Design a protein around this nucleic acid. Structure first.
Lengths: 61, 131, 86
RNA sequence: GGGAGAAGGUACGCUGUUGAUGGUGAUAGGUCUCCUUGAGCUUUCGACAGUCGCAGAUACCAGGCUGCUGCAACUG
RNA sequence: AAACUGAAGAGUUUGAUCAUGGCUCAGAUUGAACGCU
RNA sequence: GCAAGCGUUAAUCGGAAUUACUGGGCGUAAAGGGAGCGUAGGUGGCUCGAUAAGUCAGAUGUGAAAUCCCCGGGCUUAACCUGGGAACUGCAUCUGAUACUGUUGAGCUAGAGUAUGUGAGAGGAAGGUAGAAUUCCAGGUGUAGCGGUGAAAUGCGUAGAGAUCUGGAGGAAUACCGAUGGCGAAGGCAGCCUUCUGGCAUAAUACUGACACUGAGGCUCGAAAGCGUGGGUAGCAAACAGGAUUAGAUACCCUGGUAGUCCACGCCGUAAACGAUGUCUACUAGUCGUUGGGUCCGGACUUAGUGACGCAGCUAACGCAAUAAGUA
RNA sequence: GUUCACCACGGUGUGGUUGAUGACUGGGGUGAAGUCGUAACAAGGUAGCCGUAGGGGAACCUGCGGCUGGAUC
């Protein structure tokens, strides 16, 4: 990158999106539990992890 | 082609000192003579003379110095290049090696050291750092 | 191609000084004669891309010389392109 | 190339005033002749103002249009 | 007189290594929320 | 370890030099555009002047107060409040300086070009032609195999093959030379001859006088395969057919075999289009080859290419190393 | 008061842009000791890879050109 190249183009940073889109930049969010079940974990571990599919006030499920 | 005369001058000096040459010669110019004279009076090179050649041409020859077998000019880098010129005020001239080195400054009063320009209270184009 | 005789004819016609053969006018006149002469060859061998590269090069050089004259002496450039029909 | 007049809109009568304009060319000025001005007649586009009716392409005359799909390229 | 004082890295790819390179963490901050108090 | 708070979540900057201006990279880790020409632009030789726009300095006006910072003062301390400074990296207008950039006048020759003489070359385009060899066809001799493979078999052959000799048709490629040899911007380009034509290398003189470098968009060219139209069609050969092998064998091996490969004119626009290394310029130990020139006395030197080594330097290492991946 | 001019609402038509959905369908990913093979890494048992074309249940195979980021020589 020459100086002329930096002026003509300019270095841009990509802004990464949030890892918690369903919260909508809120600390917590209220939802209703649409399904309470258990599931198996990934390869190394073995258990019955307790999970709930919940539809939140933001419209996510 | 060659679009940085000052850069070429400093590059010739740097390569000659890395190769342990006694002297380095180039085509001359008043700007090159001003920079070489500043180097001489700063003590980085022994002498710099112009020999008038034919065809309205001139050769600038600089005798280098070595201390304990090492080159006196440790580092000589160009700061203001043709693609990005650097002009500073009297209170923004960058120091070299905490004042041990010299920032060659082109001011309205001519080529002079960074400390000389600071004493005169005048800025200019910071052309090189020699230490 | 052009011969030495007609090349010297062009030089003598576009002389700036005595036996100069290096001014923009004489260079552009020689280039124009050579290009107009090579148009005949390229009407015959139009698939000749390697020679056409050199023809394009002399067109580019003539254009650079004409720009240099336009920047140097405007009336001189206008008169020269007036004779050469460019 | 088209589709396409796709679809769909607006104006349209009469009266007065008014701008532009094509043709023909009497009368003059410089011989089945030429050039300039151009009377009378005539053509084609506008603008403004008014006016009547339910309605002005007022009668006769004079495309309905569109979407999806099968077939055959088409005129014949 | 002064306004001129400021800069730390770690884990994780390999049998091990150096490099590259992403991910993750230790900090500061808030008009904060939540949980325990 | 914090403490009337302590953790978690969300969010911003930091660490992240992880968009690198300060402050990174692109041979092999991600990364040089396939190559060129060139538009806007960016940048740009020497000398003497002018100007003072950039630049630098000074002055003035302004840059609100609060906040941040410094010196203090008042709250019991602190937070907080508060006086004066500093700062507000800025803008504007005058004045000065002229080293550099800009704009200009004149000059110069060293970068870049021109004229003239020699030289090498598979550089390009269009025609013609030669000699081997294959295939096919027609004959003479001749008789039982040929061909193919690791073996075979398919196949060809007593309707006479193969082998051998003699004629004919045709197409494609150009053994030897042949060479980290040459030429070309890259892609590429090999028989021989003519025609048309580009660049390059070289010695000296004369000439122009910075005319330069690079280059987004753009345009041109661009292996092979492929596509369109029209010809051609010997060999080779995708597909395809048969024979083998195999558990299977849509393969590898065998026997055939069509598009294609060839020509003309156009499209396509891609390759591990590679040196996985953009172009241009300067400088930096050396040794040995080779190509094209040149100059001296079989060598010596000097040039422009093209190779092999090898310091310093560089690199994560491998390695590069005047044809840099070194120093700019 | 009337009338004309300007004009908000509202209406008509015909397009553009974009969110959610949609039978079915294409590829991508994840998940177990599944089925078929064995394409690549060694010369990976036919060197591999790049472009392109044809073919094939599937990795892939074959042709043409290119590369070395190919061992044995």
């Amino acid at each position: 990158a020459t100086t002329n190249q930096l002026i003509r183009k300019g270095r841009k940073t990509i802004k990464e999106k949030s890892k918690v889109p369903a919260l909508q930049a809120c600390p917590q969010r209220r939802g209703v539990c649409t399904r309470v079940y258990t599931t198996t974990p990934k390869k190394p571990n073995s258990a019955m992890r307790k999970v709930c599919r919940v539809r939140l006030t933001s419209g996510y499920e | 082609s060659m679009q940085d005369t000052v850069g070429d001058m400093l590059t010739r000096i740097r390569n000659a000192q890395m190769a342990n040459k006694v002297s380095v010669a180039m085509p001359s110019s008043k700007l090159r003579k001003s920079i070489a004279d500043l180097l001489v009076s700063e003590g980085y090179v022994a002498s710099a003379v112009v020999n008038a050649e034919e065809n309205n041409k001139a050769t600038l020859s600089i005798e280098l110095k070595y201390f304990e077998g090492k080159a006196v000019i440790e580092t000589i880098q160009r700061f203001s290049r043709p693609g990005l010129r650097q002009h500073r005020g009297k209170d923004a001239i960058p120091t070299v090696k905490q004042g041990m080195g010299v920032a060659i400054v082109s001011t309205s009063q001519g080529i002079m050291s960074d400390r000389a320009a600071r004493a005169a209270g005048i800025g200019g184009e910071v052309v090189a750092f020699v230490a | 191609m052009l011969t030495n005789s007609d090349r010297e004819q062009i030089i003598a016609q576009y002389q700036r000084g005595e036996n100069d053969t290096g001014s923009p006018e004489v260079q552009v006149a020689l280039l124009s004669a050579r290009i107009n002469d090579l148009q005949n060859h390229f009407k015959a061998h139009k698939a000749d891309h390697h020679s056409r590269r050199g023809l394009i090069r002399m067109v580019n050089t003539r254009r650079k010389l004409l720009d240099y004259l336009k920047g140097k002496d405007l009336g001189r450039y206008t008169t020269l392109i007036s004779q050469l029909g460019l």
